[PDB]
Design an enzyme around this catalytic site. Structure first.
Site, PDB file in Angstrom:
ATOM      1  N   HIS A  38       1.152  -1.124  -0.218  1.00 47.28           N
ATOM      2  CA  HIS A  38       0.795  -0.035  -0.571  1.00 47.28           C
ATOM      3  C   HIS A  38       0.773   0.979  -0.300  1.00 47.28           C
ATOM      4  O   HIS A  38       0.499   2.150   0.145  1.00 47.28           O
ATOM      5  CB  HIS A  38      -0.585   0.184   1.073  1.00 47.28           C
ATOM      6  N   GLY A 140       3.562   5.275   9.634  1.00 37.87           N
ATOM      7  CA  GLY A 140       4.964   5.366   9.380  1.00 37.87           C
ATOM      8  C   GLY A 140       5.409   4.248   9.509  1.00 37.87           C
ATOM      9  O   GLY A 140       6.588   4.140   8.715  1.00 37.87           O
ATOM     10  N   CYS A 142       4.830   1.413   9.055  1.00 41.38           N
ATOM     11  CA  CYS A 142       4.279  -0.592   8.124  1.00 41.38           C
ATOM     12  C   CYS A 142       5.960   0.015   7.865  1.00 41.38           C
ATOM     13  O   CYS A 142       6.483   0.805   7.019  1.00 41.38           O
ATOM     14  CB  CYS A 142       3.747   0.298   7.025  1.00 41.38           C
TER      15      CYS A 142
END
Ligand code: 4WI
Ligand code: 4WI
Lengths: 295, 296
Positions: A38, A140, A142
Site C-alpha cells: 500500500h 509511518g 509499516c
C-alpha cells in the site's frame, strides 16, 4: 525478563521507501527491497484499492528508496501477494544470513519498530491466537519487521501493515500473505476474540518451578478434557495432545507431570495470586514459548 | 504500550570476551581500550576477600586474553579505575560509535544488552530502582554486560554489570567503575535495601494511559504534595518532589490533568485497589517508564 533479540543485524537492512506522498519502511536484503504494497496508494485509494491497476501505472523511478544518506536506484519491481519487491542496483553489503519463515499463533519474535527507515525501538512479541500482534506502532511504522535470530541466522516472520480498531496489529509474512483473515484495505475489520496461550502459560509455570517457586503447586491432577472444559471458561486456548507432548521435556526436568501442572493452573485461575508473584509478575504470562523456556 | 529497548546494534559491535586465567566475562571495546569488571583478575577464591591492588600488580598483559569474535586482541597495557579494569589493546575498534560515559539517577531508564562469552544474547529495557539495584536477568558469565541510552547518534553508557544479590536483583557500576548502591565487588553477604515504587514514573505511565484510551481512573478530586507523601510513605512509594511535578508539566499541559489531580487518581488507585479494572493492560502500576520515555 522478556528479552528481544539484539537488533543490529536487522537495523542494517532498514531503508525508507517513498512513492508519491506516501512514505514507509522497506527491508533491504541482497538486491531487493521488500515493503508493504500500500505504499503505492494515495489516501483516495485506501478504501478500495485495485493494486494491480495502481502498480501497472508505476515505473521504477516512481519509487524513492533511501538507505540512510544514499539513494538506491530501483531497476525493477513486482508484487508478491501483499508485498512489493523492489529490485535495486546494489546488493546490501550488510545483508545477514537470513531466511523467510511463517510463524504460527503462540510463537514469539522480536519487533524492530522503525520510522522513515530508521530504527526506533525493539521489543519481544507473541503472535496471538487470533493472528494479531499486541504491538506499539504509529503512523509511518509499516514495513517494520518481526524476526528471530538463531545462530546468527535471522528468520524474518512478520512485516507490519495495519492497526485494527481494538489497537492490535496485523501484517504479513515476507511473502506478503497476511496472518489471519485480514486485507490491506481500509474497510471495517475486527480481530476475532483473543484467548490466552495456555501452552505458553504452562511452560512459564514450569520455568518458575525450575527457578525457585512451588507455592502454586497442589496435590491434584486432571484429565485433559476436564482441564479444557475449565480453562475455556477463562478464555484460555484449548490444550491439545501436541501441546502435552511439547511440554514433556519440562515435565521430565521438573518431575511434575503435565496434567499435574494443568491442575495447578486451574487452581491459579480459580484463586488468583493472593498478592503474590510468579517469576516477576502478578499476571499469568503467555508470551514465553516452551522452546523459549529451555533456552 | 510496550516497554521498548533501544536498538542495540551500535553496542553489539563493541562487545568482546575477556579471560584472565580461568575467569571469563564480557568487555566493552571502544577505540583501543577494553573495559570490564575488575574482578576478572580474581580466582573463584580471591572473590571472597580480594585485595585488588595486590592482584593487579601481579598481573601482566600476557595474563589477559581478549577475543573479538574470531580475532584475538593483544593487550599492551592495563590499569584500574575504581571498579573497572581498562585493557589497552593492539587495535582500535573500527565499529566504535559516538559515545559518552554518564552516571544515571534512581528512577531513570536504560536498555541492557545481555551478553555471554562476548556474544550479545538479548536486549531489554530497565529502570534503576530507588535502592540502586536493577531487576534484570543476568546469569553466570553476564558480567561486563552494559546498559545504555541512545540520543540520536550518541550512545550514553550508564551501567556495567557486576553481581547478583540474594533477592535475585542486580548491582553494577557506571563506566568509570563507581558502584550504584551500597555494594562492593566481593563475594560476601550483602542485601538490597527495602525498595520503593518510582512515583513520578507511575504518574507518567498514567498520563500515557490517558493519552491512550484509558480514562476511568480520572476523578474530580485533587490532593497536596504533603497529603500524597504520607499516602506514599504508607505504600512504599518514592516521595513526590516539586521537581517531579515540574518535569511532568509537559504531560499535564498536554492532557489537561494537573499533577495533584493525577495524584488523587494514583492515591485512590492505591486504596480501592484497581477494582479488577486494567490500565494499559497491567494489574499493577508500571513504574519503569520515565516522563521522557512517555513523551517519546
Ligand atoms: C488504523 C487505520 C484506521 C489508519 C487503518 N486501519 C484499518 O484500516 C483497519 F482497521 F482495518 F485495520 C490502517 O491501519 N491502515 C489504513 C490503510 C493502511 C493502514 C496504515 O495506515 N498502516 C500503517 C503504516 N505506516 C500503520 C498503522 C497507522 C496507525 N497505526 C498502524 O499501525 C491500509 C490498511 C492500506
Ligand atoms: C550471585 C553470587 C553468589 C555468585 C554473587 N553475589 C554476591 O556475592 C552478593 F550477594 F554479595 F551480591 C555474585 O554475583 N558474584 C560473586 C563475585 C562476583 C559475582 C559474579 O559472579 N558476577 C557474575 C558475572 N559474570 C554475574 C552474576 C552470577 C550469577 N548471576 C549474576 O548476575 C563478585 C561480587 C566479585
Amino acid at each position: 525478563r522478556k528479552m528481544a533479540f539484539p537488533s543490529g543485524k536487522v537495523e542494517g537492512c532498514m531503508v525508507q521507501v517513498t512513492c508519491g506522498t506516501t512514505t514507509l519502511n522497506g527491508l533491504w536484503l541482497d538486491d531487493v527491497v521488500y515493503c508493504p504494497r500500500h505504499v503505492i496508494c494515495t489516501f483516495e485509494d485506501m478504501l478500495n484499492p485495485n493494486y494491480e491497476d495502481l502498480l501497472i501505472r508505476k515505473s521504477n523511478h516512481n519509487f524513492l528508496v533511501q538507505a540512510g544518506n544514499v539513494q538506491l536506484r530501483v531497476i525493477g519491481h513486482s508484487m508478491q501477494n501483499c508485498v512489493l519487491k523492489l529490485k535495486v542496483d546494489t546488493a546490501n553489503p550488510k545483508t545477514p544470513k537470513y531466511k523467510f519463515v511463517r510463524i504460527q499463533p503462540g510463537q514469539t519474535f522480536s519487533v524492530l519498530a522503525c520510522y522513515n527507515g530508521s530504527p526506533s525501538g525493539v521489543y519481544q512479541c507473541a503472535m496471538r491466537p487470533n493472528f494479531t500482534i499486541k504491538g506499539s506502532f504509529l503512523n509511518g511504522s509499516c514495513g517494520s519487521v518481526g524476526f528471530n535470530i538463531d545462530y546468527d541466522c535471522v528468520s524474518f516472520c512478520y512485516m507490519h501493515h495495519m492497526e485494527l480498531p481494538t489497537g492490535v496489529h496485523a501484517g504479513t509474512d515476507l511473502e506478503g500473505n497476511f496472518y489471519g483473515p485480514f486485507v490491506d484495505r481500509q474497510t471495517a475489520q475486527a480481530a476475532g476474540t483473543d484467548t490466552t496461550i495456555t501452552v505458553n502459560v504452562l511452560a512459564w509455570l514450569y520455568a518458575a518451578v525450575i527457578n525457585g517457586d512451588r507455592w502454586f503447586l497442589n496435590r491434584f491432577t486432571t484429565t485433559l478434557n476436564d482441564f479444557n472444559l475449565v480453562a475455556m471458561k477463562y478464555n484460555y486456548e484449548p490444550l491439545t495432545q501436541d501441546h502435552v507432548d511439547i511440554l514433556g521435556p519440562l515435565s521430565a526436568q521438573t518431575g511434575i507431570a503435565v496434567l499435574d501442572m494443568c491442575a495447578s493452573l486451574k487452581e491459579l485461575l480459580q484463586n488468583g495470586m493472593n498478592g503474590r508473584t510468579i517469576l516477576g509478575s502478578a499476571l499469568l504470562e503467555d508470551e514465553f514459548t516452551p522452546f523459549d523456556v529451555v533456552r
